[PDB]
Write an enzyme that holds these catalytic residues in place. Structure first.
Site, mmCIF file in Angstrom:
data_model
loop_
_atom_site.group_PDB
_atom_site.id
_atom_site.type_symbol
_atom_site.label_atom_id
_atom_site.label_comp_id
_atom_site.label_asym_id
_atom_site.label_seq_id
_atom_site.Cartn_x
_atom_site.Cartn_y
_atom_site.Cartn_z
ATOM 1 N N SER C 178 -5.736 -10.993 -11.204
ATOM 2 C CA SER C 178 -6.404 -9.694 -11.188
ATOM 3 C C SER C 178 -7.709 -9.561 -10.406
ATOM 4 C CB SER C 178 -6.628 -9.210 -12.619
ATOM 5 O OG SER C 178 -7.484 -10.082 -13.331
ATOM 6 N N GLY C 179 -8.840 -9.759 -11.074
ATOM 7 C CA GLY C 179 -10.120 -9.623 -10.404
ATOM 8 C C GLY C 179 -10.632 -10.957 -9.917
ATOM 9 N N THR C 183 -7.749 -10.892 -2.961
ATOM 10 C CA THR C 183 -7.595 -9.844 -1.970
ATOM 11 C C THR C 183 -8.623 -9.912 -0.846
ATOM 12 O OG1 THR C 183 -6.633 -8.353 -3.579
ATOM 13 C CG2 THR C 183 -7.506 -7.393 -1.586
ATOM 14 N N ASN C 228 -1.448 -8.206 -16.736
ATOM 15 C CA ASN C 228 -1.969 -7.805 -15.426
ATOM 16 C C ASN C 228 -1.442 -6.433 -14.981
ATOM 17 O OD1 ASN C 228 -2.032 -9.395 -12.099
ATOM 18 N ND2 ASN C 228 -3.164 -7.660 -12.978
ATOM 19 N N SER C 231 0.719 -6.861 -10.651
ATOM 20 C CA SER C 231 1.109 -8.207 -10.294
ATOM 21 C C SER C 231 2.169 -8.244 -9.203
ATOM 22 C CB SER C 231 1.618 -8.964 -11.523
ATOM 23 O OG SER C 231 1.958 -10.300 -11.178
ATOM 24 N N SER C 232 1.834 -8.926 -8.119
ATOM 25 C CA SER C 232 2.757 -9.102 -7.019
ATOM 26 C C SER C 232 3.810 -10.006 -7.594
ATOM 27 C CB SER C 232 2.075 -9.809 -5.846
ATOM 28 O OG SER C 232 1.646 -8.892 -4.851
ATOM 29 N N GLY C 452 1.465 -18.011 -9.984
ATOM 30 C CA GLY C 452 0.335 -18.750 -10.505
ATOM 31 C C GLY C 452 0.910 -19.606 -11.610
ATOM 32 N N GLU C 454 1.736 -19.320 -15.549
ATOM 33 C CA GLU C 454 1.631 -18.495 -16.727
ATOM 34 C C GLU C 454 1.850 -19.238 -18.020
ATOM 35 O OE1 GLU C 454 4.434 -15.366 -16.093
ATOM 36 O OE2 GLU C 454 3.525 -14.692 -14.224
#
Ligand SMILES: [Ca+2]
Lengths: 145, 156, 808
Positions: C178-179, C183, C228, C231-232, C452, C454
């Site tokens: 997320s943050g 990006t 999230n 999420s890609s 990632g 999980e």
């Protein structure tokens, strides 16, 4: 000891020689009574004689230096004593701070007796709770005043 | 146990001086065991002195000569009494730019703030007695100070 | 070097001399200061009070509180020389606590960057910071990592130089959810590769021609997930190309592992891809009818299983930019329709109902089928017929009709997924066309954004799939580390006693891939009609219960704290999985007749389905198998972005969230590996300058040799030969060696100061001695002179020569 040196031994020569008018060199009862006269003081027999007992008998001068065998022990010199006192005087003459000298003779070094301490204050050149050394060095020998 | 005849004669000399200043009576005050030891030629740390008899105040305890002698030699059994190497590597820790110069505000900070603290007075003195000066701002040579402090008040 | 802890720009990377000396000198004790576990905030600093048996007593710093922590819970904290440290590899105590600290204390002083071995960690500062200047760019241009402080740019210039030094394709693997700025970061890296193209001393920027696409790929590839909002669900590798002069020459995008399944399944608080909830909105009511639907995301099985919207989200605006972006990339308002209509079809492929009579299924409507049949441009009869009945062969052609109800529903679901998958590849082939305004490519530096690792309270077939992927990713890392440390040791002539680091993950990896392992046990159990969530479980237990360390088994939790059926030991920790439904989730059978027929009408469905019956897992495997073939052909670099807190609150750290990211990251695994080896390595000079005080000697510091001093200092301390090794230029240490050495020096230095003081006191006194000596001479005179006077003042004769002479 022999440190009854020359300055010490000739100064003693004129001394015995005055009390003189002499019996081929004999500090006499008379040579004595004749002196304490020009000295101006008071002559007591028993006593005046008591001065004799000190030497076995018959005081020429050879015996005069021997009699002064209580003098020579300390007898450190003139100056030497001044420098000695000097050391304990940081503020140039007017001399040493009473207290100091007390903590100095009384409990530092060859300690003085509380009895020896007084034997000293009685006379003692003093003022402003501060002691006088060229004055005491003076008394030592004896200029006077 | 070993101090030589001359070693003893030497301890004696200093010893007398000390019992002299506190009243020639054959005894010296534990407080003075550090100083005495320093006068024989040693350089003990306070821990060292306490672990060997030194008292802090003055009426507490006294020592004859035959009691101080063994102190002197136990004390002398140590060997990290300290060298130059040891004093150099330690000053460097502070040499910021690498020349052998150190602000004096700093050497003094070390000497007064760290280790067995040293007095303000004591700092000024050792510094006046060694002839160690600071310049504009090329502070103080730390080696200068080392060599001289380690050389004794009476150089020659 | 090349740093002035002052070039004002460094205000955020550096930390200035005064500031460092400041941080480097705070108070410390090695027999007491330490790391201790803290419920509220990770690990906290403390001091040890009393010991006894196995139960230590401590007092903490920032709050005071005497807690009773256990022996194997007291963390050795690192000494001051290590504060604000730049690369945690260099840390002398490499524990969690310690990794937490170094990173925290640096984020809390404005620094978002901290290297840890090969990794380049970067925390979200949540605020613009100067960091990206073209002036700094030059402070970084051409420099090898040690010359400057930690910076994302350092890993790119190097990735760039390597591409030139070794003429090898390079890859940048970046993580973080997320943050984290995963990006901006990817952006800033493509940017930088650009600026350096002007570097040989002589309609869209790259960052932009590529950022242009991110809206469209996001609509079809991103979505909400329990934890999230966006999420890609696919992995993208942006490959930025270069010519033989280091000249930027192009870009293109490769996609991996799109999460099909989602196309027909939702998890309560999850949602299908964004676009579905996008198309069905109002800035395009028109299209809502070409497609064939009613603006109501509910109304569709292939879309309603989970959630409707996402807190803090306005589909409309997105169906908005999504479309605007679809034009910028340049493609036919018509194409734009097919993709859309094609999408819409998936909405209907779900209404397509069914019923049976014996063991042959038949329709239960037909609007829905001509809706699908139409949207696709094929003939419903032939569809219904080839879905419901089919004809195949041997030489002749029988009615494969086998078909029942449990079979067609799947068949349909699979069509959907298959449609979505070809649609997405297509979509990608396109931006690539937008990108190929090329010349000639020679190399590349790809950037990979994957999932990632999980760990949820409830991990099912999806988590396993993703974890199998990161496991193979962490391994790729371990292996690189292994290869480097191997050269590193040899460059120094140190003995390498190690088996590839990659191998420590092979067990698990094998327990997943291997013929007769989790996945293959699943696949086979997928071919058995009455197979069941239970039939599968036992076959798992049967095969691997007591027989394999990795494979474990949990134990019933909280009535709702679901049932877990087995757990694996992943590099990131232990993960417990639920088996419910895998058999259903894994079948994704191909239906041939549907293809040859889907090999008809409407142009895209001509390019799409024109380009046994299998499973999700088998596909996952194939895709993964490819990402790796590709990653292993590249010289990798690792960037680790990190979410500092759940609430955008700059300068704040949540120990748990950060650690969690660390164990997954692969960051902590590296520390584990560095652990077993010699992580601390010092140049003989850095050592010469730091510990000589420990074994000083009269040889003038300058004519002395570093290695010799280093050697000699270490013997004198009788330190275990196992605790270190000597290389041609550096001495390798293990854990705590420097830790001890640092503490002995503080010790030694203090002793040496007392000593100097000792020499002063000795000087000062030895000076007073001469005086005292003099003053004894005096006083003796005074008492030996007064006392006689106290006597003599009474020797009559004495009075006389005291008179007798002034009168001479
Ligand atoms: Ca005494």
């Amino acid at each position: 000891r022999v440190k009854l040196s020359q300055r010490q031994m000739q100064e003693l020569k004129e001394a015995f020689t005055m009390i003189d008018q002499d019996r081929d060199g004999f500090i006499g009862m008379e040579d004595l009574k004749d002196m304490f006269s020009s000295l101006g003081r008071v002559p007591p027999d028993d006593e005046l004689n008591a001065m004799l007992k000190e030497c076995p008998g018959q005081l020429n001068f050879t015996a005069f230096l021997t009699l002064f065998g209580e003098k020579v022990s300390g007898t450190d010199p003139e100056d030497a004593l001044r420098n000695a006192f000097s050391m304990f005087d940081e503020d140039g003459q007017g001399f040493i701070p009473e207290d100091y000298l007390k903590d100095l003779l009384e409990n530092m070094g060859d300690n003085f007796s509380k009895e020896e301490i007084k034997n000293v204050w009685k006379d003692a050149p003093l003022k402003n709770k501060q002691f006088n050394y060229n004055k005491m060095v003076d008394i030592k020998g004896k200029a006077e005043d | 146990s070993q101090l030589t005849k001359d070693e003893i004669e030497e301890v004696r000399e200093v010893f007398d001086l000390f019992d002299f200043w506190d009243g020639r009576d054959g005894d010296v005050d534990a407080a003075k065991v550090g100083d005495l030891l320093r006068c024989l030629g040693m350089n003990p740390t306070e821990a060292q002195v306490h672990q060997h008899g030194g008292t802090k105040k003055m009426g507490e305890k006294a020592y004859k000569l035959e009691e101080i002698l063994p102190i002197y030699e136990e004390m002398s059994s140590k060997d990290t009494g300290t060298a130059a190497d040891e004093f150099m590597e330690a000053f460097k820790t502070f040499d910021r730019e690498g020349q052998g110069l150190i602000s004096s505000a700093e050497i003094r900070n070390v000497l007064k703030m760290l280790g067995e603290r040293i007095t303000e007075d004591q700092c000024n003195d050792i510094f006046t007695f060694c002839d160690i000066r600071e310049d504009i701002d090329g502070n103080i040579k730390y080696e200068d100070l080392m060599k001289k402090v380690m050389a004794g008040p009476f150089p020659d | 070097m090349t740093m002035d802890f002052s070039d004002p720009d460094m205000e955020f990377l550096c930390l200035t001399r005064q500031k460092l000396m400041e941080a480097t000198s705070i108070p410390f004790d090695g027999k007491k200061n330490c790391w201790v576990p803290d419920p509220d905030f990770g690990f906290v600093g403390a001091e040890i009070q009393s010991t006894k048996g196995d139960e230590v007593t401590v007092k903490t710093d920032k709050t005071q509180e005497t807690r009773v922590v256990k022996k194997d819970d007291i963390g050795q904290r690192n000494p001051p020389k290590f504060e604000m440290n730049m690369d945690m590899a260099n840390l002398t105590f490499l524990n969690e606590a310690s990794i937490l600290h170094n990173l925290r204390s640096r984020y809390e002083s404005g620094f978002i960057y901290t290297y840890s071995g090969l990794f380049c960690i970067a925390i979200n500062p949540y605020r613009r910071l100067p960091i990206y200047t073209q002036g700094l760019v030059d402070k970084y241009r051409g420099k090898r990592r040690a010359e400057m402080p930690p910076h994302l740019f350092s890993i790119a210039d190097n990735a760039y130089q390597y591409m030139l030094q070794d003429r090898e394709n390079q890859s940048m693997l970046i993580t973080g959810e997320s943050g984290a700025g995963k990006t901006e970061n990817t952006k800033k890296v493509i940017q930088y590769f650009a600026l350096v193209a002007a570097s040989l001393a002589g309609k869209g920027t790259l960052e932009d021609q590529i950022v242009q696409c991110n809206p469209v790929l996001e609509a079809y590839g991103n979505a909400k997930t329990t934890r999230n909002n966006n999420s890609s669900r696919f992995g993208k590798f942006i490959r930025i190309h270069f010519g033989t002069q280091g000249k930027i020459a192009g870009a293109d995008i490769e996609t991996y592992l799109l999460e099909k399944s989602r196309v027909t399944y939702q998890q309560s608080a999850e949602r299908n891809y964004h676009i579905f909830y996008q198309l069905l909105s109002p800035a395009f009511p028109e299209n809502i009818e070409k497609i064939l639907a009613v603006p109501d995301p509910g109304l569709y099985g292939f879309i309603n299983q989970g959630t409707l919207t996402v807190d803090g989200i306005d589909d409309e605006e997105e169906m908005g930019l999504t479309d605007t972006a679809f034009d910028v990339l340049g493609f036919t308002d018509e194409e734009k329709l097919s993709m859309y209509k094609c999408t819409g079809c998936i909405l209907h492929l779900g209404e397509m109902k069914w019923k049976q009579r014996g063991e042959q299924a038949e329709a239960d409507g037909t609007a829905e089928a001509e809706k699908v049949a139409f949207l696709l441009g094929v003939n419903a009869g032939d569809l219904l017929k080839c879905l419901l009945k089919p004809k195949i062969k041997v030489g002749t052609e029988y009615v494969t009709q086998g078909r029942n109800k449990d079979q067609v529903t799947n068949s349909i679901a699979a069509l959907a997924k298959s449609l979505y998958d070809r649609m997405f590849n297509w979509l990608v082939r396109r931006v690539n066309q937008t990108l190929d305004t090329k010349a000639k490519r020679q190399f590349f530096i790809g950037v990979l954004d994957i999932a990632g690792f999980e760990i949820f309270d409830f991990n099912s077939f999806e988590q396993l799939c993703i974890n199998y992927t990161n496991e193979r990713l962490q391994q790729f890392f371990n292996h690189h580390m292994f290869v480097l440390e191997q050269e590193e040791y040899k460059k120094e002539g140190i003995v390498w006693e190690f088996i590839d680091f990659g191998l420590d993950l092979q067990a698990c990896i094998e327990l997943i891939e291997k013929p007769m392992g989790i996945l293959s046990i699943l696949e086979e159990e997928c071919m058995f009609p009455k197979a069941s969530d239970t039939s599968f479980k036992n076959k798992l237990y049967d095969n691997h219960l007591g027989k394999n360390p990795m494979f474990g088994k949990p134990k019933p939790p909280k009535a709702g704290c679901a049932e877990a059926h087995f757990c694996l030991h992943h590099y990131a920790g232990s993960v417990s999985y639920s088996i419910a439904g895998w058999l259903d989730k894994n079948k994704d059978p191909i239906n041939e007749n549907v293809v040859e027929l889907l090999q008809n009408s409407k142009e895209p469905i001509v390019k799409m389905l024109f380009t046994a019956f299998q499973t999700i897992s088998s596909v996952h495997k194939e895709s993964l198998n490819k990402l790796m073939k590709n990653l292993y052909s590249t010289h990798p670099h690792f960037v680790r972005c990190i979410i500092p807190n759940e609430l955008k609150t700059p300068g704040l750290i949540d120990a748990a969230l950060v650690l969690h990211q660390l164990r997954c990251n692969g960051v902590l695994e590296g520390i584990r590996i560095c652990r077993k080896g010699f992580p601390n390595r010092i140049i003989y000079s850095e050592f010469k300058q730091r510990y000589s005080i420990l074994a000083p000697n009269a040889v003038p510091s300058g004519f002395a040799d570093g290695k010799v001093v280093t050697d000699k200092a270490l013997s004198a301390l009788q330190l275990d030969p196992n605790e270190y090794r000597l290389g041609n230029t550096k001495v390798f240490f293990k854990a705590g060696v420097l830790g001890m050495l640092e503490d002995m020096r503080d010790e030694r230095l203090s002793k040496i100061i007392s000593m100097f003081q000792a020499h002063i006191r000795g000087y000062l006194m030895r000076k007073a001695y001469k005086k005292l000596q003099d003053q004894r001479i005096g006083l003796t005179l005074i008492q030996r002179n007064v006392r006689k006077w106290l006597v003599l003042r009474n020797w009559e004769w004495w009075r006389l020569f005291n008179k007798v002479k002034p009168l001479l």
